[PDB]
Amino acid sequence: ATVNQLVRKPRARKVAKSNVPALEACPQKRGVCTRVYTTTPKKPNSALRKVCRVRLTNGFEVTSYIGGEGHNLQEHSVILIRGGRVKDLPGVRYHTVRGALDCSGVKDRKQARSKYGVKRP
Amino acid sequence: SMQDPIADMLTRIRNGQAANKAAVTMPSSKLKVAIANVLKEEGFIEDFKVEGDTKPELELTLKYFQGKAVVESIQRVSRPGLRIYKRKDELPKVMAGLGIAVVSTSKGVMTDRAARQAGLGGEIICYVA
RNA sequence: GGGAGAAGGCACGCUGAUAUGUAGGUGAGGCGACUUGCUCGUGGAGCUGAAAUCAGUCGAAGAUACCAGCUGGCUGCAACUGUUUAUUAAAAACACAGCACUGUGCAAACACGAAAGUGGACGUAUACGGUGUGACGCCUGCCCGGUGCCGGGAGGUUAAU
RNA sequence: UAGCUAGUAGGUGGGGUAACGGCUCACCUAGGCGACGAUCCCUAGCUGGUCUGAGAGGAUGACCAGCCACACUGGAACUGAGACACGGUCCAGACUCCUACGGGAGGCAGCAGUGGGGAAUAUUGCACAAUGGGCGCAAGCCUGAUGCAGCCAUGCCGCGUG
RNA sequence: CCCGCAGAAGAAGCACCGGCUAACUCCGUGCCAGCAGCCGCGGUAAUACGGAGGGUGCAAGCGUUAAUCGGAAUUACUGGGCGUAAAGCGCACGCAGGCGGUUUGUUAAGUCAGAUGUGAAAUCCCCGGGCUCAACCUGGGAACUGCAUCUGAUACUGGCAAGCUUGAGUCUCGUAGAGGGGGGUAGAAUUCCAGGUGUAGCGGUGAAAUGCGUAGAGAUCUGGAGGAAUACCGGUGGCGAAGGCGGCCCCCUGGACGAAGACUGACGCUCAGGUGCGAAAGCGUGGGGAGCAAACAGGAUUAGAUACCCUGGUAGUCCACGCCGUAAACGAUGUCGACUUGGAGGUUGUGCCCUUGAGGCGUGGCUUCCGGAGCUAACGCGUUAAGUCGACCGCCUGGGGAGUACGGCCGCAAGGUUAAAACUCAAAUGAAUUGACGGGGGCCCGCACAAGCGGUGGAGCAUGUGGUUUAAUUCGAUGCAACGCG
RNA sequence: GUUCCCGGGCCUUGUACACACCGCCCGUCACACCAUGGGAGUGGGUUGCAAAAGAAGUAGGUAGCUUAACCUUCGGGAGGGCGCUUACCACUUUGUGAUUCAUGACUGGGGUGAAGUCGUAACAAGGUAACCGUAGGGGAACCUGCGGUUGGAUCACCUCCU
RNA sequence: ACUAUGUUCACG
Numbered sequence A: 001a002t003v004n005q006l007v008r009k010p011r012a013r014k015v016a017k018s019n020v021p022a023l024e025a026c027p028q029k030r031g032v033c034t035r036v037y038t039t040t041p042k043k044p045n046s047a048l049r050k051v052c053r054v055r056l057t058n059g060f061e062v063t064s065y066i067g068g069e070g071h072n073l074q075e076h077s078v079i080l081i082r083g084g085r086v087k088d089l090p091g092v093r094y095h096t097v098r099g100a101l102d103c104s105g106v107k108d109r110k111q112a113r114s115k116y117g118v119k120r121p
Numbered sequence B: 001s002m003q004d005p006i007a008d009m010l011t012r013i014r015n016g017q018a019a020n021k022a023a024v025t026m027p028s029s030k031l032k033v034a035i036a037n038v039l040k041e042e043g044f045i046e047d048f049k050v051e052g053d054t055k056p057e058l059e060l061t062l063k064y065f066q067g068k069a070v071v072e073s074i075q076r077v078s079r080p081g082l083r084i085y086k087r088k089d090e091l092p093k094v095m096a097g098l099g100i101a102v103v104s105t106s107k108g109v110m111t112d113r114a115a116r117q118a119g120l121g122g123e124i125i126c127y128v129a
Numbered sequence C: 001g002g003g004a005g006a007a008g009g010c011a012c013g014c015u016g017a018u019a020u021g022u023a024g025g026u027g028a029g030g031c032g033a034c035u036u037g038c039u040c041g042u043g044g045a046g047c048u049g050a051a052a053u054c055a056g057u058c059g060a061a062g063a064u065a066c067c068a069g070c071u072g073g074c075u076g077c078a079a080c081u082g083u084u085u086a087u088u089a090a091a092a093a094c095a096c097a098g099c100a101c102u103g104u105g106c107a108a109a110c111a112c113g114a115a116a117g118u119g120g121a122c123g124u125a126u127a128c129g130g131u132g133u134g135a136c137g138c139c140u141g142c143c144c145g146g147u148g149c150c151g152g153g154a155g156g157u158u159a160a161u
Numbered sequence D: 001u002a003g004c005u006a007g008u009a010g011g012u013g014g015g016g017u018a019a020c021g022g023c024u025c026a027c028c029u030a031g032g033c034g035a036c037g038a039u040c041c042c043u044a045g046c047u048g049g050u051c052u053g054a055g056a057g058g059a060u061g062a063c064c065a066g067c068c069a070c071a072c073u074g075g076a077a078c079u080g081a082g083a084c085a086c087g088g089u090c091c092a093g094a095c096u097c098c099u100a101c102g103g104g105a106g107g108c109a110g111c112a113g114u115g116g117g118g119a120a121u122a123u124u125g126c127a128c129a130a131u132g133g134g135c136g137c138a139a140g141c142c143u144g145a146u147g148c149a150g151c152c153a154u155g156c157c158g159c160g161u162g
Numbered sequence E: 001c002c003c004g005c006a007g008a009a010g011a012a013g014c015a016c017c018g019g020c021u022a023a024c025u026c027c028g029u030g031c032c033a034g035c036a037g038c039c040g041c042g043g044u045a046a047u048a049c050g051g052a053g054g055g056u057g058c059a060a061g062c063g064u065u066a067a068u069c070g071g072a073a074u075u076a077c078u079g080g081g082c083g084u085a086a087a088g089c090g091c092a093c094g095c096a097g098g099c100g101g102u103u104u105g106u107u108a109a110g111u112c113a114g115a116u117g118u119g120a121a122a123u124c125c126c127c128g129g130g131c132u133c134a135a136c137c138u139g140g141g142a143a144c145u146g147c148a149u150c151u152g153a154u155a156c157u158g159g160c161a162a163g164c165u166u167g168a169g170u171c172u173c174g175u176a177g178a179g180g181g182g183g184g185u186a187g188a189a190u191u192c193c194a195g196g197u198g199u200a201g202c203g204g205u206g207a208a209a210u211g212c213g214u215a216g217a218g219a220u221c222u223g224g225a226g227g228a229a230u231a232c233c234g235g236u237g238g239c240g241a242a243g244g245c246g247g248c249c250c251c252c253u254g255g256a257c258g259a260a261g262a263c264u265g266a267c268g269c270u271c272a273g274g275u276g277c278g279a280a281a282g283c284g285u286g287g288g289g290a291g292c293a294a295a296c297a298g299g300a301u302u303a304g305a306u307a308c309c310c311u312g313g314u315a316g317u318c319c320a321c322g323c324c325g326u327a328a329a330c331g332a333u334g335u336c337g338a339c340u341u342g343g344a345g346g347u348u349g350u351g352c353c354c355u356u357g358a359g360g361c362g363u364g365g366c367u368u369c370c371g372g373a374g375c376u377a378a379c380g381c382g383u384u385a386a387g388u389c390g391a392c393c394g395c396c397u398g399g400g401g402a403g404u405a406c407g408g409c410c411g412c413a414a415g416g417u418u419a420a421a422a423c424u425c426a427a428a429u430g431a432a433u434u435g436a437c438g439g440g441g442g443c444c445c446g447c448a449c450a451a452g453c454g455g456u457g458g459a460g461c462a463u464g465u466g467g468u469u470u471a472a473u474u475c476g477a478u479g480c481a482a483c484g485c486g
Numbered sequence F: 001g002u003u004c005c006c007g008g009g010c011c012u013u014g015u016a017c018a019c020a021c022c023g024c025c026c027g028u029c030a031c032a033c034c035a036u037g038g039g040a041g042u043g044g045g046u047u048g049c050a051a052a053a054g055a056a057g058u059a060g061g062u063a064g065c066u067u068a069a070c071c072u073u074c075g076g077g078a079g080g081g082c083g084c085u086u087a088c089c090a091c092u093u094u095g096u097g098a099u100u101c102a103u104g105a106c107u108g109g110g111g112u113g114a115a116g117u118c119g120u121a122a123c124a125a126g127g128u129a130a131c132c133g134u135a136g137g138g139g140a141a142c143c144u145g146c147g148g149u150u151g152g153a154u155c156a157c158c159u160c161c162u
Numbered sequence G: 001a002c003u004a005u006g007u008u009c010a011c012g
Ligand SMILES: [Mg+2]
Pocket: A040, A041, A042, A045, A046, A047, F114
């Protein structure tokens, strides 16, 4: 406030940081993948959530959630990563794209198959 | 410490109307009389005087139609901290043209309606609803 | 304050020129004058003379000889200059400024001395002696059972007489 | 990031520039910029616009058009009306290159295309028929400029699928 | 582009269906598997998971991801705030800067009006036109919010000359005050020191003990030494910018307020950097040290007690000279000015009548409390505003990370000051409301306690549970409110 | 007989409780993961200063070697070209800083994680009111001193007064 | 006088 104060120091616009550091406004990104493993979520949930560390191509080292029931990911295996938090595993802030590269489609799925990368019956 | 005298006039008018007060004394000036006469001429104030030789005291006489006051709202626009000069076509119209904006134009102080027809702009002193 | 000559660089000879030797130093024959002078203040003839810049020029090399720092980084110990085993040890040892405890009221404590007397001191507690520690910065914790020291005086034991 | 700055800031005179100018010299003066942000650091081609918004604004600058900049990296000039010259020249460099070992090449940020990078983005097509461009009296020759074609639901829009 | 056959023939997916948000059932699964844009779904009757049917929404596309704006008045110029939610620097002085009472001039910088040039074309926009239609192309128009110059206008703002008196300041005269700085001295008390009296305790506590005492303490009296603090007066009293400031007396000294004049003639208000002051605790050096008292020791308490309680007790607390620069430095409320109903006090002035008897009306300063309009999320504030406006400054932008790190600046140090980011959460927060609770308060009541009386718990047996055993020892009840219970 | 123990009733008050005190809740310690500062250092990027360097070219100077037109006394003048040379200067070299990004034994805190350990600091007078500053102490919340704030509770137990 | 604690998610 005070118009003279604003002339002397203008309104600093709140530069809101991005949720997902995949960098340079990229839709998806390749990941070599290391340590595929299970993890427990926060309070009201309780499960064994399937998740992997992902050595990204640009240099970053991120965890990514593995959606669907069952997966082919292990040790290495090159996968594709898209954005999206899980909101349960604190730290996990990406999703593996099912269908793309070494990550295969979910077995025996019918409804909602673009998500989970499965072809027609 | 008394930076804007014109705003102080318009508060005395606003605060006189809130208190249901008959008359409103204050130190006079050239620009005070010009504004006070425009408010009278259209009909927010009911008469005024400028009694005094050495130390003049301009007192107004506020209008009341019902129990409610006549001056609904009155505010300073072109304050000394931020002067607001509008052009001919960019002149405002208060309350969609049933209130007035006192505007100091090159041909004396006048209403915004008169400034449009006269064909000129100026410093918009105050909106009066 | 330093470190610091940190590190590391560049320029250096000779010959002309600027300048028939310069700024500078320097002061004479003069001339005011002021008086009696080993005079004041001009005055600047000669001698003297850097340091530069510019242009040449020779050599492989110009601070050419003698003379005359090796430098930087990490780290222990001791703050420092100093002292020390004359004649195998120079140091981290001693000392040191600074710090604490302690004694000492002046015929001071203490020391040398059978003593007289001397130093301490022709000083007097902001002084003096002893002990430890050892600039400076941050600090210096618990134990008084044992050994010492200090204070207390009832009681026990206790010499000479 | 609080001080930067010695051709630095101005003068006189000489040279040089198509043109004026510390453009560049010699001397002279001691400035100049700086809290209305110099200097230093990081980032960035700029605009018409584009998207968004009630508007103010916010974000952005692919395609079309104007300006600038650059041409393997670092320099220099020559030629010319125009360049300190994408497909000139000369050095130097890194990397590919062929040789008879003496020495030579070479420059896709023109068009196709390859490897590599990437989440990701196309044919080693046809044609000067038009529209400009180049030279030439012209005819014409030249032209990956342009006009077509390929590819891709990448969009906007039409008709399907009775 | 036009006809010519041919035959529905070759030509439909994929999101979603718990709320936001258009659309529901059934099986499978059982906090698993999984979903998730936000809230959240799944623990054996899932509308949210997986499948199935059914629906809904788009359809040669659909969804997911990323990216920008929007909604976000969540950086607020249009258009937000700062008593308690995030947010008034601890308080002053003050240069640059922002703002400035009032009347004449006078310019024309701002401002306003007009005019001319330009603001490339495309794009956008509107009326047309052309492709079967559309997208697309396209004619004209408007626009290009601008910038420049040129001529005017003088209200306002500025510059510039005089003013002028309301602001602001000076002088005269008094009044009040723990304003300050320096120096004296007074009495009460506490402690220790010396002595007299005197005979077992004193001291302390919830209860004890450590501690002091037959060496004669405690108590009592006399004389003395110290140091620190000033009973009563003393108040919702006063003074100070804030921090803060109390015995009494002098020395120097700053301000405040009133009275009626005279003078100056806007000299003013704010203030980034900057400087000054700034409780307590610390820190340095030199003193001082009664009481008190971090640390520390012992004794209790306790499961433990590095605490609370007790007995001791050093730095410190005190003075001189420097440093520190912070506090819930608080009215949690920046400074200055104007304006807008009241009431009850306190405090300090000053005028007019009769002091005609501790009177009475008035008008000023400072101040405590309760309330009106109005404001506020509410609580509340309310002429000393958080009301109504103006000037300027400081600050805020979800909670954690963090007033932390790094770097600067300052500091002897302690540390102060300036001040991030990654990461992480969907909250954190304020006021008020209804309950419930409290080792909060009041008032009652009940075999609740007291006042009694007889029992259980000891024994043996009956019965019921737990357990253990068993082929089975069916099943249920399992704090009061299950256990001679169904 | 009503002070206390237990339960209940009404009123008032504080509350960080609403599964409503059998409530909430703080910090160490233990484990896992993530980001993050310090750290003997190590490995780059950029870049300041101080020099050395000097290829090509351009210009200035020219003892040397030349040489078509102009002038000519038919001798040669002029002028030019090469070579040399000086200046300007690129590559490159040396030293030393600055800054910035990686990385590093170990280490300091920080965040997150359904049912770990130790206590119970806070919210009620939270059982010693809480909190702010500061100093000392302590396994941990914290405790203690000094000053400050109310964002503390009860102020029918005293007893005696207006 | 002193006098500690109440595993997790839920049901409203
Ligand atoms: Mg879990």
